[PDB]
Amino acid sequence: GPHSMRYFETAVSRPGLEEPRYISVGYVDNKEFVRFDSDAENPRYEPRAPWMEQEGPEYWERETQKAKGQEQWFRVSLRNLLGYYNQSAGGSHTLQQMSGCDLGSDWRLLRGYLQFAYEGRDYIALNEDLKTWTAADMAAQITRRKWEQSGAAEHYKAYLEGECVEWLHRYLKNGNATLLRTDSPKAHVTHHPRSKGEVTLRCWALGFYPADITLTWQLNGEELTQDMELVETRPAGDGTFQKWASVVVPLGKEQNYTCRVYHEGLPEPLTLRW
């Protein structure tokens, strides 16, 4: 299936200090393999993944150096951002960025990604053509105006299509055993009384990788969408994920309901009930 690399960067300005806090985190197939924190004692990208240890000093050097560059970039942008939104002083602000590339089972590019956000909201994102921009609001327009004039897109476009793709292939080659692995989910159902004539049924899926998964409930046939609480997939802490789905079933009538779990490492959809 698909593969990807992402670099989630966060810069949070803060009063009384002119150095915003910068935290950059790289992921591969949505798995942390590198991190940088401006608040650490000696800032530098650190290996967050076992297969990332083989990288030599030259590597970490260049990477860290770039992070140093980003800090300035975020330090500045954050500043202009303050002016754009005629914001005041001694407040704390957040500017985030997501960068990266998606690949198909064939390791050939699918999408190029670049988009920023200010205060948790969309600000500006490079469109899928890797040529134009999309500004979330008025302010963002000025940045687009300037970014079109500088022709920045071509620069990011190059990265997204060359070095992003190329370096992902490598990490994938190195993280072979870790990344391209899959853990089938392990499901089970639980019972609880909810209302007077109703009952809560919870379909559990545990210890699976990758995170992506599909849990569905259905009345002896068609699927169910009413009063069906599906919890946000969460990390188990050991690298595998968990998730569950509940459905308000009328007491007594229960073996009539069934849930199916869909997942890569699954030879065929898990089906089960109470």
Partner: peptide, 9 residues
């Protein structure tokens, strides 16, 4: 392999 934005916001 991190990216490097050069034109500021």
């Amino acid at each position: 392999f991190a990216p490097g934005n050069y034109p500021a916001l």
